[PDB]
Amino acid sequence: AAVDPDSGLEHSAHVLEKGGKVFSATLGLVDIVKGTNSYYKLQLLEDDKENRYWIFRSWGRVGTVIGSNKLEQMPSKEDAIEHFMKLYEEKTGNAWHSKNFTKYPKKFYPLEIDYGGTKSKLPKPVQDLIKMIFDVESMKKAMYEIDLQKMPLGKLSKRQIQAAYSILSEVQQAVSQGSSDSQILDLSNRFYTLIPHDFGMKKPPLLNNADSVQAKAEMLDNLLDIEVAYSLLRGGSDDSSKDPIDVNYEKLKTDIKVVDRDSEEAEIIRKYVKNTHATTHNAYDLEVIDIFKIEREGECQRYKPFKQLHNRRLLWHGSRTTNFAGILSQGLRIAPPEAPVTGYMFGKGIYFADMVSKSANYCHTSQGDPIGLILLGEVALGNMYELKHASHISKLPKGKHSVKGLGKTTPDPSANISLDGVDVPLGTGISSGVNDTSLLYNEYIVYDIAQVNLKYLLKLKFNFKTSLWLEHHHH
Amino acid sequence: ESSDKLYRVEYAKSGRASCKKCSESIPKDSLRMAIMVQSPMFDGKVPHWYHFSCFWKVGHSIRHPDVEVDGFSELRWDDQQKVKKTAEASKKEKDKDSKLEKALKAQNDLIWNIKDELKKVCSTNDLKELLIFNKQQVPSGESAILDRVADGMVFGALLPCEECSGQLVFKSDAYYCTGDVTAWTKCMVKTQTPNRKEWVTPKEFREISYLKKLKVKKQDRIFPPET
DNA sequence: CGTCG
DNA sequence: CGACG
Ligand SMILES: NC(=O)c1cccc2nc(-c3ccc(C(=O)NCCc4nc5ccccc5[nH]4)cc3)[nH]c12
Ligand SMILES: [Zn+2]
Ligand SMILES: [Zn+2]
């Protein structure tokens, strides 16, 4: 683990480790009822060499300078650990070796913080793709980054963020109903104690606002999928040959083949992207860099039951490139049954888009990341049970296989093509006439992971129409 | 809502508080005013104390001492009428409010006449036992001990909360529950007519009760006129 | 433990 | 929060 700098001994001493455990407690305390956002860092530090020990305490509010610290050199490690454990007790109410931690009122709460020559012979575009999707550098930029506001105390562990996400599921189901204000107050208390937030001297807010709740949930899902793709990023310890290119290429169990750019299917994909790129609500042009026909292991056979099901279509699915690795390793997944269902526009299930713009908006490619990823999928939308206004659902209607959120903007229905007997809606944005609706662009949704079959993966370039492109566009 | 109420007033719980102006210690059991300020040492407010005169020497424009000061309605009626003055220094409804305020004055003087003999004859452990014997909750501090004893003897032995079952206590505006619904939150249930039973004095405190001359004049907690 | 900073 | 009677 680390060493708090307010002691100043990071260069002169390190934190202690015995019996597997480590002596660095990060207790929090959040009370929205009064507005208390207190912290407490407690460390037992041993000199790098000599047998000299200190107990370091630091307290105050989150993010602000309000607080203090104190270092107390101890006599020996024995007395030092005695004082450390009795301090942990006095503060959090539980003992150091308390397997099951039981929260007590007016007491703090500990927080888990995570720490710690050959040649490939493959086609080159795939190796570039791999270097992108297994980009350990960006993975570290995601997890191991400062951003004090996000992590005012430290990089929380996976279990912490997952528990926070579950409590947010509870918050969502309370927002949907007319829950008691006290229940939501307790939800806020626990969610802010579990995840610290620099609110300055401002009283921490309540989670009454549903939109901010969904935003924090997006943040938590981001961090969660990040740590998951990081756990997938690791795991190799054999086959030390053919560069890690082959290693992480075979870690996906997928057959990836760079579709010839000049090929017919590639031309049809380019026309799809061109027509369905609605610059409206999208301040960025798109350039088709690379095409990849992907055959995912197993997904090919599990899709056969619906191979004959009529009304199959090629659709866009787009998420952060960070997840794409896992999305290729395990195939497109559905939200878990225990995740909240009110946040989803049309409930849990594979989402799709006939407008590449909408699906691309989810890649969250920033100005500093002009490259994005998106997937073309042969989904066998059996029968589209259409829904104009948003509506969370559970029961698939009788003889209906999929949901279609209707937006006024749709691909030109006349402009469509049957590739492999699959309808491709590569038309330009026309006014569907659908009125009294909530969606802008159409949403296509299925509710069976086998109903989908990922066919192509597009490397896209998000040429944001900025000063650079602006100079290139007037000469 | 408490709303902090930085202006604060009460009797000196100890003789250790130093006046932030003259630096002299504030004697125990002496009327003293403070202002609640956010300390830089920890995430928690703290009272800067002053002598009653030193507080008004530093200049304050308190227009409504009752509402802007936490604990104003918990003092002696005489010290109250002193603060009410020092702060700035109808046809029938008029007499109605005047007479009800006279009743408030009587009630305040009565409670203090109680507490006087209460601590004069009884020890702290005796008050603790009195509170225990009425399903109450022993508070921290002799002052709060005698406050809850007087409350239970005048308005009846308080009964557990309806939600969390924690004992509630009288606040400036109404009775607030001090219980903890869960380990993460505190109960904010607030009402002006809580459920109570009658106070009970054991045989031990029978001759002592006679020494107190317990009148047992039943009544109801008068709450502030504000709104 | 109960104040005060 | 810690510090002290
Ligand atoms: N990429 C496409 O192909 C695509 C195309 C068109 C529409 C699309 N909608 C999605 C989508 C949105 C949202 C989610 C999603 O995690 N919900 C989260 C809702 C939510 N609130 C919460 C609040 C608290 C706790 C947990 C919460 N989850 C998944 C897919 N993807 C779309
Ligand atoms: Zn003074
Ligand atoms: Zn209660």
3-state secondary structure chain A: CCCCHHHCCCCCEEECEECCEECEEEEEEEECCCCEEEEEEEEEEEECCCCCEEEEEEEEECCCCCEEEEEEEECCHHHHHHHHHHHHHHHHCCCCCCCCCCCCCCCCEECCECCCCCCCCCCHHHHHHHHHHCCHHHHHHHHCCCCCCCCCCCCECHHHHHHHHHHHHHHHHHHHCCCCHHHHHHHHHHHHHHCCCCCCCCCCCCCCCHHHHHHHHHHHHHHHHHHHHHHHHCCCCCCCCCHHHHHHHHCCCEEEECCCCCCHHHHHHHHHHHHHCCCCCCCCEEEEEEEEEEEECCHHHHCHHHCCCCCCEEEEECCCHHHHHHHHHHCCCCCCCCCCCCCCECECCCEEECCHHHHHHCCCCCCCCCEEEEEEEEECCCCEEEECCCCCCCCCCCCCCEEEECEEEEECCCCCEEECCEEECCCCEEECCCCCCCEEECEEEECCHHHCCEEEEEEEEEECCCHHHHHHCCC
B25 touches strand C (CB under 7 A): no
Looking at B60, B89, B118, which one is the last position of a domain? B89
CB B7 within 8 A of CB B33: yes
Encoding tokens for residue A361?
């908006």
Encoding tokens for residue A243?
């560069």
| Residue whose structure tokens are 């009653």 | B52
CB A451 within 8 A of CB A350: yes
Contact yes or no for A38 and B41 at CB 8 A: no
Name residues whose C-beta falls within 8 Å of residue B163's C-beta, 6 or more positions apart in sequence: B177, B179, B181, B187, B189
CB B184 within 8 A of CB B153: no
Nearest ligand to the CA of B158 is 3
- The verdict on B80 and B98 lying in the same domain is no
- The verdict on B75 and B156 lying in the same domain is no
Query: Resolution (in Å) of the shown entry?
Result: 3.8
Encoding tokens for residue B135?
């399903």
* Pick from A203, A206, A174, A201: nearest CA to A190: A206
CA pseudo-torsion sign A409, A413, A415, A418: positive
A159 vs A224: CA distance, rounded Å? 9
- The verdict on B56 and B166 lying in the same domain is no
Name residues whose C-beta falls within 8 Å of residue A264's C-beta, 6 or more positions apart in sequence: none
Please state the domain count of chain B.
Answer: 2
A307-345 in b/e form (b: 16+ CB < 10 A) is eeeeebbbbbbbbbbbbbbbbbbebbebeeeebbbbbbb
Work out whether strand A454-463 and strand A285-296 pair parallel, antiparallel, or are unpaired: antiparallel
A468-474 contacts: CB < 8 A, separation 24 or more?
A: A469/A285
- The verdict on B105 and B203 lying in the same domain is yes
- The verdict on B69 and B113 lying in the same domain is no
- The verdict on B104 and B158 lying in the same domain is yes
* Pick from A153, A194, A145, A144: nearest CA to A58: A153
**Gaps in chain A with C–N over 2.5 Å, residue before each:** 116
A51 vs A45: CA distance, rounded Å? 10
- The verdict on B18 and B47 lying in the same domain is yes
Domains of chain A plus CATH, in order, are 124-247 (1.20.142.10), 248-473 (3.90.228.10)
**Ligand 1 atom at minimum distance from A362 CA:** 1
* Pick from A215, A210, A220: nearest CA to A171: A210
Helix then strand then coil, in percent of chain B rounded to 5, is 40, 15, 45
Encoding tokens for residue B90?
């109808």
Length of chain A: 475
**Residues paired with B32 in a beta bridge:** B10, B51
Q: Nearest-CA residue of chain A relative to B3?
A: A34
Phi–psi pair at A244, nearest 5 degrees: -65, -10
Separation of CA B31 and ligand 2 centre (Å): 12
B212 vs A400: CA distance, rounded Å? 83
- The verdict on B70 and B159 lying in the same domain is no
Instruction: Specify the nucleotide whose C1' lies closest to residue B46 (CA).
Output: C5
| Residue whose structure tokens are 């918990």 | B74
Phi–psi pair at B78, nearest 5 degrees: -70, -50
- The verdict on B84 and B94 lying in the same domain is no
Q: Nearest-CA residue of chain A relative to B44?
A: A36
CB A94 within 8 A of CB A102: yes
B142 touches strand C (CB under 7 A): yes
Encoding tokens for residue B29?
């059991």
Boundaries of domain holding B135? 90-225
> Residue B202 CB: number of other CB atoms within 10 A?
11
CB A318 within 8 A of CB A282: no
Distance in Å, alpha carbon of A109 to nearest chain B alpha carbon: 10
CA pseudo-torsion sign A27, A30, A34, A38: positive
Encoding tokens for residue A115?
């720490």
This structure was determined by X-ray
The DSSP string of B3-29 is ---SEEEEE-SSS-PBPTTT--B--TT
Best of B43, B46, B163 to substitute, by most chain A Cβ atoms within 10 angstroms, is B43
A186 vs A31: CA distance, rounded Å? 9
- The verdict on B56 and B120 lying in the same domain is no
Best of B185, B188, B189 to substitute, by most chain A Cβ atoms within 10 angstroms, is B185
DSSP assignment letter at B167: P
- The verdict on B64 and B150 lying in the same domain is no
Work out whether strand A285-296 and strand A422-424 pair parallel, antiparallel, or are unpaired: unpaired
* Pick from A366, A14, A68, A72: nearest CA to B41: A68
What residue's CA is closest to ligand 1, atom 27? A217
Instruction: Indicate left, alpha or beta for A303 from its phi (over 0: left) and psi (-120 to 50: alpha).
Output: alpha
The DSSP string of B110-126 is HHHHHHHHHHHH--HHH
CB A189 within 8 A of CB A109: no
A228 vs B145: CA distance, rounded Å? 56
> Residue B126 CB: number of other CB atoms within 10 A?
17
Looking at B89, B108, B126, which one is the last position of a domain? B89
- The verdict on B79 and B160 lying in the same domain is no
Mutual angle of helices B204-212 and B93-121, in 10-degree steps = 130
Looking at B89, B117, B142, which one is the last position of a domain? B89
CB A14 within 8 A of CB A2: no
* Pick from A372, A353, A361: nearest CA to A279: A361
> Residue B224 CB: number of other CB atoms within 10 A?
13
